[PDB]
Amino acid sequence: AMKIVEVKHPLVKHKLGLMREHDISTKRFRELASEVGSLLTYEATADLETEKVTIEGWNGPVEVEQIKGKKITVVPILRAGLGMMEGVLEHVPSARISVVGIYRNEETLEPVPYFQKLVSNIDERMALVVDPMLATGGSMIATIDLLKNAGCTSIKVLVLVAAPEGIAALEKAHPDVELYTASVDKGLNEHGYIIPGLGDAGDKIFGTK
Template identity: 55%
Template sequence: MPHVTVVDHPLVQHKLTLLRDKSRSTAGFRRLIKEVTLLLGYEVTRDLPLTTRRIETPLAEMEAPALKGKKLVFASVLRAGEGMIEGLIELVPSARIAHIGLYRHPQTLEPVQYYFKAPDDIADRPVIVVDPMLATGNSVAHAIDLLKAKGATQLRLLCLLAAPEGIAALDRRHPDVPIVTAAIDSHLNDHGYIVPGLGDAGDRMFGTK
């Protein structure tokens, strides 16, 4: 899977284990989501374009590296994507945020859209789609459909966990979108949940179950 990057850094893997533990409190789960996402953020932003600008250090003038072009966009797939935004904003405080409201129909497992708001000039910005779980791939693929329809072309996906079925589905619909994740798990169960996974990320994050 050349378009999938699994971040196997020891800290990422250790914190992911803590996240998976069903005894983790809501507060602990939220804190770990932020920490893992911040660490993954370094990898997903690794190839952002650079330019240089003239600055003066306490000792001399120099041409120093700086991000090139317009500020990037983090596109949060609601609601679970919101839990990852805090860590990313800590890493890139000037980033713009897009919101894509989708829920998964319990019978069909297909995404149902209820909200979409993104910067008008998103076509000129790198976009990182953020969703903790790449399970069936339907919701993320639909979110990317919406972003591309608005003009986005520089897209990548950041998730905590991915299932092989979700990777294959996204590759069929959006083979141009690279994926950065902390792990690829075994499979999906009959309800479309990742196994072994970590349960419903939104429910655990917001204490709704």
Template identity: 55%
Template sequence: MRNVHHITHPLVQHKLTLMRRSDASTTTFRTLLNEVSSLMAYEVTRDMPLQDVEVQTPLETMTGQMIDGKKLVFVSILRAGNGILEGMLSVVPGARIGHVGLYRDPTTLEPVEYYFKMPQEMAERDIIIVDPMLATGNSAIAAVTRLKQLKPKSIKFVCLLTCPEGLAAMGKAHPDVDIYTAAIDRELSEHGYILPGLGDAGDRIFGTK
């Protein structure tokens, strides 16, 4: 799939492997997630537009280039998406933040929306959706569908892990959305979890397992 970007940087892969370990503490998991998210942010924002600005150096005036972080919105799919936000914001601190509250029905595995809050004037903004997992793809598809109603300039999706099933579902529903991931794992379990995966990201981030 041409719109799938597999981030294979050695530091990302090293830290992700440490996160997968079942004996990693909640504190360790959060710290690693923050670090991995920061590293991934560099790849995700690689094509962000720049604008010329005049700056005064200690020696003379020059024209440099800067991004307009206020035009970027990080959208977290609650609750696990919040674990990625801090790392992303460390790279683009001026970005706005939106939240989509979705939970997965344990029987149907379909997403149910319970919260939606975005900045104003979304038609002028680029959106980066963050969620640690792209598993069945149902939540991601629902979030993208909802956000497209606001007609943003662009939408990207960032996750730590995904699998062939999730990529196929997302690609079929939203072929125009680029996906950035640190790993494409083997498959989904019968309960909708990524294998080999790293367990329930939300539980591991917030210590609620």
């Protein structure tokens, strides 16, 4: 079974609620997207492996803990992904950024990957994939294909809202990934959008239509 973690922290639910206002501004919506993305990053990095090391402290040698392994890689799915990347980099600013571009065909609801440039030695790195919505799951399944195809074994997915249909498709497609969502909504409408959902999060964050 796929590891699913619905973050129920009061601040996460409060800020997610503000983003559901249909009259919210693009500015406010962008700040909240990055803010909630920052909190989901703290929930997803709670199981990182640490190692004890001795360093010269203010009053002589002292034992400190550092994150074991090579630097993490943040995988923002263009375009909506960038609206959450700043919140992630806040806790891991040395993270390697692997930009992946994917837009959805509103006619077929299938993913259309147009860009990718992953970091090197990704097989020795953990990937934090950030995308505000998990509706049918096509875009996330297409992203994980590129990562595993590149040799990445450790993958974590951070999303604001996720529909059961998208969680089911992702689980049968890649059950070894861990999903961290700020909410599990009811489902999808006849146009493939999540309900209650956040609407067209992508165009709402970039200010397009």
